[PDB]
Design an enzyme around this catalytic site. Structure first.
Site, short mmCIF file in Angstrom:
data_model
loop_
_atom_site.label_atom_id
_atom_site.label_comp_id
_atom_site.label_asym_id
_atom_site.label_seq_id
_atom_site.Cartn_x
_atom_site.Cartn_y
_atom_site.Cartn_z
N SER A 155 -4.33 8.10 7.18
CA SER A 155 -3.71 7.17 6.25
C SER A 155 -2.63 7.78 5.38
O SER A 155 -2.86 8.75 4.67
CB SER A 155 -4.75 6.62 5.35
OG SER A 155 -5.88 6.06 6.01
N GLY A 156 -1.43 7.26 5.44
CA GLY A 156 -0.38 7.77 4.63
C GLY A 156 0.59 8.52 5.51
O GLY A 156 1.80 8.31 5.36
N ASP A 187 0.80 -1.23 0.00
CA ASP A 187 0.00 0.00 0.00
C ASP A 187 0.82 1.27 0.00
O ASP A 187 0.85 2.02 0.98
CB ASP A 187 -0.91 -0.08 1.22
CG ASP A 187 -1.96 0.99 1.50
OD1 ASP A 187 -2.23 1.84 0.65
OD2 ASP A 187 -2.55 0.95 2.58
#
Lengths: 51, 241, 60
Positions: B185-186, B88
Protein backbone atom coordinates in the site's frame (compact mmCIF):
# COMPACT_ATOMS: atom_id res chain seq x y z
CA UNK A 1 -0.63 15.97 -30.42
CA UNK A 2 -1.92 12.37 -30.67
CA UNK A 3 0.09 10.73 -33.62
CA UNK A 4 3.59 9.94 -32.17
CA UNK A 5 2.40 12.01 -29.27
CA UNK A 6 3.70 15.31 -30.86
CA UNK A 7 7.40 15.04 -31.82
CA UNK A 8 8.41 15.74 -28.24
CA UNK A 9 10.03 13.60 -25.63
CA UNK A 10 7.19 13.73 -23.09
CA UNK A 11 4.36 16.34 -22.48
CA UNK A 12 1.99 17.76 -25.17
CA UNK A 13 -0.85 20.31 -25.51
CA UNK A 14 -2.97 21.61 -28.41
CA UNK A 15 -2.29 25.41 -28.59
CA UNK A 16 -4.82 26.67 -31.10
CA UNK A 17 -3.55 24.34 -33.93
CA UNK A 18 -0.02 23.54 -32.90
CA UNK A 19 1.23 20.98 -30.30
CA UNK A 20 3.06 22.66 -27.37
CA UNK A 21 5.31 20.14 -25.95
CA UNK A 22 7.00 20.73 -22.61
CA UNK A 23 9.10 18.67 -20.11
CA UNK A 24 8.88 17.42 -16.55
CA UNK A 25 10.72 18.93 -13.64
CA UNK A 26 14.28 19.64 -14.38
CA UNK A 27 14.35 18.92 -18.05
CA UNK A 28 15.04 21.88 -20.34
CA UNK A 29 13.30 21.70 -23.81
CA UNK A 30 15.55 21.78 -26.87
CA UNK A 31 15.87 24.64 -29.41
CA UNK A 32 13.53 22.41 -31.46
CA UNK A 33 10.41 22.71 -29.15
CA UNK A 34 10.65 18.92 -28.77
CA UNK A 35 13.42 17.33 -26.65
CA UNK A 36 13.82 17.67 -22.83
CA UNK A 37 17.51 17.52 -21.74
CA UNK A 38 18.38 15.96 -18.42
CA UNK A 39 19.09 18.44 -15.72
CA UNK A 40 20.13 16.56 -12.68
CA UNK A 41 22.57 13.53 -12.76
CA UNK A 42 19.94 11.06 -11.38
CA UNK A 43 16.59 12.53 -12.71
CA UNK A 44 12.94 11.55 -12.53
CA UNK A 45 11.82 8.45 -14.25
CA UNK A 46 15.15 7.01 -15.21
CA UNK A 47 16.68 3.96 -13.57
CA UNK A 48 20.01 2.39 -14.53
CA UNK A 49 23.82 2.85 -14.61
CA UNK A 50 26.43 4.02 -17.13
CA UNK A 51 26.48 3.52 -20.77
CA UNK B 1 3.29 -8.16 -4.59
CA UNK B 2 1.81 -11.59 -5.49
CA UNK B 3 3.57 -12.66 -8.80
CA UNK B 4 6.08 -10.70 -10.96
CA UNK B 5 9.92 -10.71 -10.73
CA UNK B 6 12.21 -9.25 -8.12
CA UNK B 7 13.63 -5.80 -9.18
CA UNK B 8 17.28 -5.85 -10.25
CA UNK B 9 19.83 -2.99 -9.66
CA UNK B 10 18.81 0.08 -11.48
CA UNK B 11 15.22 -1.03 -11.62
CA UNK B 12 12.94 0.51 -8.99
CA UNK B 13 14.88 3.59 -7.60
CA UNK B 14 11.83 5.62 -6.62
CA UNK B 15 10.63 3.25 -3.90
CA UNK B 16 10.41 3.87 -0.12
CA UNK B 17 9.83 1.29 2.54
CA UNK B 18 7.99 3.07 5.38
CA UNK B 19 9.42 0.94 8.23
CA UNK B 20 8.14 1.03 11.84
CA UNK B 21 9.25 1.24 15.56
CA UNK B 22 11.72 -1.64 15.37
CA UNK B 23 12.71 -2.92 11.86
CA UNK B 24 9.61 -4.11 9.95
CA UNK B 25 8.17 -2.50 6.82
CA UNK B 26 4.44 -2.02 6.61
CA UNK B 27 3.71 0.23 3.67
CA UNK B 28 5.29 1.78 0.66
CA UNK B 29 5.94 5.13 -0.88
CA UNK B 30 7.48 6.77 -3.90
CA UNK B 31 10.48 9.17 -3.65
CA UNK B 32 9.00 12.29 -5.14
CA UNK B 33 12.02 14.50 -4.62
CA UNK B 34 14.63 14.71 -1.90
CA UNK B 35 12.29 15.93 0.80
CA UNK B 36 8.94 14.27 0.25
CA UNK B 37 7.77 10.63 -0.06
CA UNK B 38 4.25 9.96 -1.57
CA UNK B 39 1.96 7.35 0.10
CA UNK B 40 -1.62 6.19 0.81
CA UNK B 41 -3.31 7.93 3.79
CA UNK B 42 -4.56 4.63 5.26
CA UNK B 43 -0.91 3.53 6.00
CA UNK B 44 -0.84 6.14 8.69
CA UNK B 45 -2.70 3.90 11.15
CA UNK B 46 -0.48 0.73 11.39
CA UNK B 47 2.60 2.40 12.67
CA UNK B 48 4.07 4.43 15.31
CA UNK B 49 7.52 5.26 13.86
CA UNK B 50 7.25 5.40 10.01
CA UNK B 51 11.05 5.53 9.64
CA UNK B 52 11.62 5.89 5.83
CA UNK B 53 14.41 3.51 4.65
CA UNK B 54 15.29 4.72 1.11
CA UNK B 55 17.77 2.46 -0.69
CA UNK B 56 16.60 -0.93 0.53
CA UNK B 57 16.15 -3.62 -2.13
CA UNK B 58 16.14 -7.08 -0.46
CA UNK B 59 15.33 -6.57 3.27
CA UNK B 60 16.89 -9.59 4.93
CA UNK B 61 20.33 -8.69 3.79
CA UNK B 62 20.22 -5.42 5.82
CA UNK B 63 23.61 -4.23 4.47
CA UNK B 64 24.89 -0.87 3.32
CA UNK B 65 23.21 0.84 0.45
CA UNK B 66 19.93 1.65 2.21
CA UNK B 67 19.23 4.52 4.69
CA UNK B 68 16.36 5.17 7.11
CA UNK B 69 15.18 8.81 7.30
CA UNK B 70 12.74 10.09 9.88
CA UNK B 71 9.98 12.45 8.99
CA UNK B 72 9.40 16.08 9.70
CA UNK B 73 5.65 16.27 8.66
CA UNK B 74 2.83 14.10 7.32
CA UNK B 75 -0.29 15.62 5.38
CA UNK B 76 -3.47 13.42 4.55
CA UNK B 77 -5.88 15.02 1.92
CA UNK B 78 -8.90 16.34 3.97
CA UNK B 79 -11.59 14.43 2.26
CA UNK B 80 -9.79 11.08 3.01
CA UNK B 81 -12.85 9.11 3.92
CA UNK B 82 -11.34 6.34 6.16
CA UNK B 83 -13.36 3.06 5.43
CA UNK B 84 -13.91 4.39 1.96
CA UNK B 85 -10.24 4.71 1.00
CA UNK B 86 -11.20 7.73 -0.97
CA UNK B 87 -8.79 10.50 -1.50
CA UNK B 88 -6.31 8.03 0.09
CA UNK B 89 -3.16 10.11 -0.14
CA UNK B 90 -0.41 11.75 1.87
CA UNK B 91 2.84 13.48 0.95
CA UNK B 92 5.27 13.45 3.90
CA UNK B 93 8.38 15.57 4.55
CA UNK B 94 11.70 14.13 5.82
CA UNK B 95 14.36 15.77 7.95
CA UNK B 96 17.24 14.50 5.90
CA UNK B 97 17.28 14.78 2.14
CA UNK B 98 17.84 12.09 -0.30
CA UNK B 99 21.27 11.88 -1.95
CA UNK B 100 20.11 9.93 -4.84
CA UNK B 101 22.58 7.22 -5.79
CA UNK B 102 22.41 3.62 -7.03
CA UNK B 103 18.86 2.66 -6.43
CA UNK B 104 17.62 6.18 -5.47
CA UNK B 105 16.29 8.69 -8.18
CA UNK B 106 12.90 10.55 -8.14
CA UNK B 107 9.77 9.57 -10.08
CA UNK B 108 8.14 12.20 -12.34
CA UNK B 109 4.67 13.44 -11.81
CA UNK B 110 2.78 13.99 -15.11
CA UNK B 111 0.40 16.88 -15.80
CA UNK B 112 -3.31 16.00 -15.86
CA UNK B 113 -4.27 16.10 -19.52
CA UNK B 114 -1.27 14.35 -21.14
CA UNK B 115 -1.66 11.79 -18.32
CA UNK B 116 -5.26 10.60 -19.15
CA UNK B 117 -4.83 10.86 -22.88
CA UNK B 118 -1.37 9.40 -23.37
CA UNK B 119 -0.27 7.65 -20.27
CA UNK B 120 -3.23 5.94 -18.73
CA UNK B 121 -4.32 4.73 -22.13
CA UNK B 122 -1.19 2.66 -22.17
CA UNK B 123 -1.54 -1.04 -21.70
CA UNK B 124 0.37 -1.67 -18.50
CA UNK B 125 1.95 0.08 -15.47
CA UNK B 126 4.60 -1.04 -12.94
CA UNK B 127 3.75 -1.42 -9.28
CA UNK B 128 6.35 -2.40 -6.57
CA UNK B 129 6.97 -3.24 -2.91
CA UNK B 130 8.17 -5.77 -0.38
CA UNK B 131 4.58 -6.74 0.65
CA UNK B 132 3.12 -10.23 0.80
CA UNK B 133 3.99 -12.68 -1.79
CA UNK B 134 0.56 -14.38 -1.42
CA UNK B 135 -2.60 -13.42 0.63
CA UNK B 136 -2.44 -15.94 3.48
CA UNK B 137 1.37 -15.92 3.21
CA UNK B 138 4.12 -13.48 4.26
CA UNK B 139 6.23 -10.65 3.33
CA UNK B 140 8.87 -10.50 0.72
CA UNK B 141 12.17 -9.53 2.04
CA UNK B 142 12.79 -8.58 -1.66
CA UNK B 143 11.58 -5.55 -3.72
CA UNK B 144 9.48 -7.04 -6.48
CA UNK B 145 7.99 -5.33 -9.51
CA UNK B 146 4.80 -6.20 -11.24
CA UNK B 147 3.94 -5.10 -14.64
CA UNK B 148 0.07 -4.85 -14.60
CA UNK B 149 -2.53 -3.97 -17.22
CA UNK B 150 -4.95 -1.11 -16.75
CA UNK B 151 -8.50 -2.40 -16.70
CA UNK B 152 -11.61 -0.45 -17.78
CA UNK B 153 -13.58 1.47 -15.28
CA UNK B 154 -16.95 0.05 -16.38
CA UNK B 155 -15.63 -3.44 -15.99
CA UNK B 156 -13.86 -3.09 -12.57
CA UNK B 157 -16.94 -1.33 -11.09
CA UNK B 158 -19.01 -4.50 -11.19
CA UNK B 159 -16.18 -6.44 -9.81
CA UNK B 160 -16.00 -4.62 -6.50
CA UNK B 161 -18.14 -4.96 -3.38
CA UNK B 162 -16.92 -1.63 -2.20
CA UNK B 163 -17.38 1.70 -3.94
CA UNK B 164 -14.84 2.51 -6.63
CA UNK B 165 -15.11 6.33 -6.43
CA UNK B 166 -14.14 8.99 -9.18
CA UNK B 167 -10.65 8.90 -7.56
CA UNK B 168 -9.78 5.32 -8.30
CA UNK B 169 -8.76 2.95 -11.10
CA UNK B 170 -8.13 -0.81 -10.90
CA UNK B 171 -5.47 -2.85 -12.69
CA UNK B 172 -4.31 -6.43 -12.97
CA UNK B 173 -5.48 -9.82 -13.95
CA UNK B 174 -8.85 -11.24 -12.95
CA UNK B 175 -7.99 -14.94 -13.47
CA UNK B 176 -4.15 -14.67 -13.82
CA UNK B 177 -2.09 -15.38 -10.60
CA UNK B 178 -0.42 -11.89 -9.96
CA UNK B 179 -1.55 -8.82 -7.91
CA UNK B 180 -0.36 -6.11 -5.51
CA UNK B 181 -0.73 -7.19 -1.84
CA UNK B 182 -0.57 -6.64 1.92
CA UNK B 183 2.12 -4.17 2.91
CA UNK B 184 2.54 -2.82 -0.65
CA UNK B 185 0.00 0.00 0.00
CA UNK B 186 1.36 3.35 -1.02
CA UNK B 187 4.14 1.93 -3.24
CA UNK B 188 4.54 3.37 -6.74
CA UNK B 189 2.47 2.87 -9.89
CA UNK B 190 4.68 4.16 -12.70
CA UNK B 191 4.01 4.34 -16.41
CA UNK B 192 6.91 4.71 -18.80
CA UNK B 193 6.41 6.83 -21.75
CA UNK B 194 9.61 6.33 -23.94
CA UNK B 195 12.07 6.14 -21.11
CA UNK B 196 10.80 8.47 -18.55
CA UNK B 197 8.55 6.80 -16.01
CA UNK B 198 5.77 8.90 -14.52
CA UNK B 199 3.67 8.25 -11.39
CA UNK B 200 0.16 7.23 -12.36
CA UNK B 201 -1.01 5.92 -9.00
CA UNK B 202 -0.50 5.09 -5.36
CA UNK B 203 -1.31 1.44 -4.38
CA UNK B 204 -4.68 1.82 -2.59
CA UNK B 205 -6.61 -1.39 -1.64
CA UNK B 206 -7.92 -4.87 -2.54
CA UNK B 207 -10.31 -7.66 -1.41
CA UNK B 208 -7.71 -10.32 -0.44
CA UNK B 209 -4.82 -10.75 -2.91
CA UNK B 210 -4.55 -12.21 -6.53
CA UNK B 211 -8.19 -12.93 -6.11
CA UNK B 212 -10.59 -14.39 -8.61
CA UNK B 213 -12.61 -12.06 -10.71
CA UNK B 214 -10.78 -9.37 -8.87
CA UNK B 215 -8.40 -6.66 -9.90
CA UNK B 216 -6.12 -4.48 -7.70
CA UNK B 217 -7.35 -0.88 -6.88
CA UNK B 218 -4.98 2.19 -7.01
CA UNK B 219 -5.29 5.95 -6.12
CA UNK B 220 -5.44 7.84 -9.45
CA UNK B 221 -2.66 10.44 -8.98
CA UNK B 222 -3.72 12.54 -12.09
CA UNK B 223 -6.84 13.46 -10.09
CA UNK B 224 -4.53 14.34 -7.21
CA UNK B 225 -1.98 16.66 -8.87
CA UNK B 226 -2.43 20.20 -7.62
CA UNK B 227 -2.98 18.89 -4.06
CA UNK B 228 0.48 17.19 -4.03
CA UNK B 229 2.13 20.40 -5.30
CA UNK B 230 0.31 22.85 -2.99
CA UNK B 231 1.50 20.66 -0.11
CA UNK B 232 4.86 20.56 -1.99
CA UNK B 233 5.63 23.98 -0.61
CA UNK B 234 3.26 24.47 2.36
CA UNK B 235 3.31 21.16 4.09
CA UNK B 236 1.46 20.92 7.52
CA UNK B 237 -2.28 21.23 7.47
CA UNK B 238 -4.26 19.61 4.72
CA UNK B 239 -5.78 22.61 2.85
CA UNK B 240 -9.09 23.14 0.96
CA UNK B 241 -8.98 19.40 0.96
CA UNK C 1 -4.26 -3.60 1.18
CA UNK C 2 -6.51 -6.37 2.01
CA UNK C 3 -9.79 -4.69 2.81
CA UNK C 4 -11.20 -7.93 4.09
CA UNK C 5 -9.33 -7.64 7.29
CA UNK C 6 -11.45 -4.70 8.79
CA UNK C 7 -14.57 -2.48 9.32
CA UNK C 8 -13.08 -0.57 11.94
CA UNK C 9 -15.44 0.71 14.76
CA UNK C 10 -17.73 -2.30 15.47
CA UNK C 11 -20.81 -2.17 13.23
CA UNK C 12 -23.88 -3.25 15.62
CA UNK C 13 -24.60 -6.73 14.45
CA UNK C 14 -26.32 -9.10 16.72
CA UNK C 15 -27.79 -10.84 13.71
CA UNK C 16 -28.08 -14.58 14.05
CA UNK C 17 -28.19 -16.81 10.83
CA UNK C 18 -31.85 -16.70 11.91
CA UNK C 19 -31.61 -12.96 11.21
CA UNK C 20 -29.28 -13.29 8.26
CA UNK C 21 -26.02 -12.38 9.85
CA UNK C 22 -22.95 -13.79 8.24
CA UNK C 23 -20.18 -14.94 10.48
CA UNK C 24 -16.87 -13.32 9.58
CA UNK C 25 -13.55 -12.96 11.32
CA UNK C 26 -12.32 -9.57 10.97
CA UNK C 27 -9.10 -8.93 12.72
CA UNK C 28 -9.44 -7.86 16.36
CA UNK C 29 -7.37 -5.58 18.47
CA UNK C 30 -3.93 -6.93 17.73
CA UNK C 31 -2.90 -10.49 18.29
CA UNK C 32 -5.57 -12.28 16.25
CA UNK C 33 -8.97 -12.38 14.57
CA UNK C 34 -12.53 -11.91 16.08
CA UNK C 35 -15.95 -13.38 14.83
CA UNK C 36 -18.82 -11.02 14.12
CA UNK C 37 -22.38 -11.78 12.79
CA UNK C 38 -22.72 -9.29 10.07
CA UNK C 39 -26.21 -7.97 9.74
CA UNK C 40 -27.95 -8.10 6.40
CA UNK C 41 -28.32 -4.34 6.02
CA UNK C 42 -24.59 -3.88 6.68
CA UNK C 43 -23.53 -6.79 4.45
CA UNK C 44 -21.41 -5.35 1.58
CA UNK C 45 -21.30 -8.78 0.10
CA UNK C 46 -17.57 -9.11 0.17
CA UNK C 47 -15.99 -12.57 0.25
CA UNK C 48 -15.00 -12.23 4.05
CA UNK C 49 -12.85 -14.64 6.15
CA UNK C 50 -14.80 -17.66 7.03
CA UNK C 51 -12.50 -18.70 9.78
CA UNK C 52 -9.82 -18.04 12.34
CA UNK C 53 -7.23 -20.05 10.36
CA UNK C 54 -7.45 -18.14 7.08
CA UNK C 55 -8.05 -14.77 8.57
CA UNK C 56 -5.13 -14.88 11.08
CA UNK C 57 -2.55 -16.09 8.40
CA UNK C 58 -4.20 -13.70 6.06
CA UNK C 59 -4.61 -10.64 8.20
CA UNK C 60 -1.93 -11.34 10.86
Amino acid sequence: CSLDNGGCDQFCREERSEVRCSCAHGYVLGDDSKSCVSTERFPCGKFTQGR
Amino acid sequence: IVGGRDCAEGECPWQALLVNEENEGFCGGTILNEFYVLTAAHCLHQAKRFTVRVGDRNTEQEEGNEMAHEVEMTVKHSRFVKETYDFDIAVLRLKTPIRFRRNVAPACLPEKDWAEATLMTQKTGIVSGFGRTHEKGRLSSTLKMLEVPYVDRSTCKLSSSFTITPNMFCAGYDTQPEDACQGDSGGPHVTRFKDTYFVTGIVSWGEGCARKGKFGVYTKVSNFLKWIDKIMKARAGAAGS
Amino acid sequence: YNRLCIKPRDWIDECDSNEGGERAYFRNGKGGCDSFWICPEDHTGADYYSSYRDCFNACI
